Symmetry: C3
Subunit: 307 residues, 3 copies
Amino acid sequence: VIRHFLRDDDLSPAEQAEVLELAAELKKDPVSRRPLQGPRGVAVIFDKNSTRTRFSFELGIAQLGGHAVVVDSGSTQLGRDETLQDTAKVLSRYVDAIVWRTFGQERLDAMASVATVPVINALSDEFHPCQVLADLQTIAERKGALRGLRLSYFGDGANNMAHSLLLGGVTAGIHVTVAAPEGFLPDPSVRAAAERRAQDTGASVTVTADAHAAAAGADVLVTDTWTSMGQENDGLDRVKPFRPFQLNSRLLALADSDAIVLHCLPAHRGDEITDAVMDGPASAVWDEAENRLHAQKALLVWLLERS
Amino acid sequence: VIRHFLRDDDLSPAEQAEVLELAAELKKDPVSRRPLQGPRGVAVIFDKNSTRTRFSFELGIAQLGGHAVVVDSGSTQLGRDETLQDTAKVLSRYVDAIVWRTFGQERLDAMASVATVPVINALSDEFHPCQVLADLQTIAERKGALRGLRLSYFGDGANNMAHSLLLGGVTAGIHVTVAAPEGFLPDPSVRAAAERRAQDTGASVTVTADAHAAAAGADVLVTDTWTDRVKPFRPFQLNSRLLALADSDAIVLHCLPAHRGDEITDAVMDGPASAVWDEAENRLHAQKALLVWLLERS
Amino acid sequence: SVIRHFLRDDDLSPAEQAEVLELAAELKKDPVSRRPLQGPRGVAVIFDKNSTRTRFSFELGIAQLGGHAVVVDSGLGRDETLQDTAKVLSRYVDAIVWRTFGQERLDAMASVATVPVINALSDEFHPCQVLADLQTIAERKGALRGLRLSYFGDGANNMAHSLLLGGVTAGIHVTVAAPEGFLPDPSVRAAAERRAQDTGASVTVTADAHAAAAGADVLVTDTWTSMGQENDGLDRVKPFRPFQLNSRLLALADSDAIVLHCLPAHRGDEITDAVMDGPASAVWDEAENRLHAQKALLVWLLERS
Ligand SMILES: O=[N+]([O-])c1ccc(B(O)O)cc1
Ligand SMILES: O=[N+]([O-])c1ccc(B(O)O)cc1
C-alpha cells in the first residue's frame, strides 16, 4: 500500500517516532541514505511559491541521491487544463514521490487517491505537517522526550500551524493549548481529530482566549504570522484581535523557566513576536528552520521504504 | 560534423531506427549511459514555457550524468540582449548540447548553423519531433515492427504534431493519413518532404476530410488539442464510434494535455486501446536516446 | 579560522590572487578534480536582480565541485533581515553567492555569515569577471606583472572599478579612459593606487582615448549603460562615442594586443564587429573562464574557511 503524508495524523504515534528518529540520524549523517540514487526524480510542485519550502526540499532530495524537478506557479496551475487524476498518473511514471504545495485539502486527497507514489503536503491552507515534524525534532533536541510536555500556540488559531501543532503535537504525547481570540479558533473537525488521537497518547487539547493562562507552566511557546497572503483582503482587522497574544518577554516570563520558543519563518518582528524573544536564549527558531531539511528528508526516506 | 535534430526527417530511416533502439535500451536501464558524467552541462532554453517538455528533459539529462541549466520565463529569452550568434558561441563553451523551445524555425536553423554543439528542437510551432520519437517508441512496444502499420491523425492537420507524424511516421515506414477539415491542412512543403521520404521506406501520405475512411483499418489513431470556434473539428473527435472502425488491437495516442470531451472522449482515453500514459513516460526515454546518439556523433 | 569573503577584488592579497588564478588554470585542465562540495553540500546562489549568465556559470561550477546550487531569484531585506538570512543560510549551505546592488548589503551579510560570501556581481564591483579576465590574459600573454591594460567607456561602473583593483593586484598598469563626469569612485581609485604601490603597478585616469590605447597590451570595454541607468536623465551615447573600441583604436595598441569585453556586447556602440570578431578578441575564452575562475575562487575560500 502506498503511504501518503497529507496531514500530521497520517502517521500513527509509533510511525511518527520512527520518522523523528530518522530525522536525528540524517542530521548526523546527511548523505548516508540514498533511496533516490540514480538519480530518481521527485516532483516538487507549487500552486503558490514558497522559497523556503522549495529550498529545503530541493537540497534534501539531492542529498538522498535524487533530482528534484521543481514546478513553480509560473506553470499552468494543476487542474486548469488537465485533471488532477491525469497529472497523478503521468507523474507516477516520472518520479518516485510527489511533493505538493496547494490550497484546499480536497486537492491533496484527489492526487493521493490516484497516485501510485507517495504524495506529501509540503504546505497547504489547512495543515503544515512537514514544519511540525521539524518543530518536534527541534523540541526533542532541546528538551529530550516529547511525552508529557506542555506546548502553547498563540495567535490565529485556525491557520495551518495551529492545526498541525494540534494534530502532530498530540500524536507525540504533547499537551497542546491553542490561545486565540474568538472567531479565530481551530476548525472543529481538526480539534475533534486531535482530541481523539490524544486519547491514544495521554495528551490533551485546550483552546482558550486567556493568553496568560496558556503561557503559565508551558514548556514550549509557539506563534506564527497573524495573516497569510491570501487573507490580506479578507476585510478583517488582523492586528487588534491578536495584540493580547503577542509572544513577548512578559508572556515568556510566565512560562516554565526552561521554556523554548518556536516560530515558522518568516516572522514579522514586533507583531506576533518581539526582537527580545526572537534573539534571546529561549529561541529555537534557527535550529527549527534548519531542521526542515532533516525532517523532510526523513519523511521521504520513511515513505519511500513503506511504499 | 555536428548533428542537429530540428525536424523529424533530420534523421534518416536507419538513424531513426538506431535512436528508437537506444530508447528501448535506456527504458530498461535508465542510468547505464553516462555521456554527460562530470557533470557536463546541457542548456534547456524556453522562449515560451512548456512545463512537460522541461520536466522530461531536466530529469533525462540528470540520468545521463549531466546537469541541465534551464532558462525559462523570467530568465532572459535568447536574442534580447545579444545576437543569437554571440549566445551560440558562449553556450558552446559551457554545455555539450542546446535544447531549445522556440517558435519560428528560422531561429532554430540560425542557432544550429553557428553552434558547435548539437541543437535539439524541444518543441516548435512547425514540428514536435521529440514527441513523435516517443510515439514511435510507444507503438513499437505495443505492436512490434513499425514498417507497414497504418497511422491516422485526426483534428488540426496544420499543427506541429500533424507535421511531425507525417515526417517521422513515413521515416519509420508507416503509412500516414491526416484527417482534417479544409482550413487546417498540412503545410505544403512539409507534405512534399514526407511524400519524398515515403518513397524510400515504402510508406505513403494521405490527406482527407473523411474521418471514417481514415479510421477504417487504422492500427494507430492519434489526435491533439484543437487549439464555437471549434466547429470544424467536431466530426474528427476520437470517440468510441471512430475507434470501433479500426483494426483489432489498434492503439490511441495523444500528446498531453487532453481536453476530455473535445478532441477525445473519456471512454477512448481510459479504454484498453489508450496508450497515452506510456506515451507520456516515453518522452523521457526517447529524448535521452536522442541526446546520447547526437552526443556520440558530435 | 577566519571566514574569508570575496566582495571586491582587493579582498585577495597579490599572493592570494596568484593562488586563485593558478587554481583556475588547474581546474580548466581537470574540471572535476576538486570536490570540496561532494555530498552534495549546498551553495546558495541568490539574485536580487536576475542574471542568467551569472546563474549558468555558478550553477554548473558548483555542480562540478560536487555540490548542489540552490538558486533564489528576484521573483532579501523585504520579508526578513539580512542578518536573519545569513544566520539560517549558514546552517544550510557551505557558501553564499549573491548578486545584489549596493555594497553595504554585501558587507552586512558577510559581517554575520559563518560561511564565505561571494559577490557574484554588484553595482560597484564585478570581481569574479575580473578573475576570469586575468585568467584569460595569462593564457594569451603569460606573466601578468608589468602588462599595460586600458579600459574605455564608463569609468565609474563595476567593471572599471574591478579592473582597477584586480588589475593592480596582479601587477598590471591600469588606465581608465572615460569622459568627464564618468570617472572612477575616489575611494576605489585611492585603494587601487595604494595596492599598486605594493605590486609595482600604477593607476592612470584620462579622457584621451588615443593616449590610453597607445602601447597597450590589453584593451577592455563594457556596455555604456546599465539597466538601472537607462532612466538617469543623461545622454549616454554622445559622451562615449570617442571611446568606442574600434579598429582605429586597436591599431594604436601593441601589435600583439588582445581585447576583452564582459558580455553582452552592444555591437556598434562600445565595440565594433570587426574588433569583436577579429583575431585580437579574447571575449569568448573570457566568457568561458567565468566558470573556471569562479570554481577556483570557491575552492580557495572553502579551504581557507
Ligand atoms: O527551509 N529552508 O530551506 C529555509 C531557507 C531559508 C530560510 B530563511 O532565510 O528564513 C528558512 C528556511
Ligand atoms: O514529459 N513530461 O515530463 C511530462 C510531465 C507531465 C505530464 B502531464 O501531467 O500531462 C506530461 C509529460
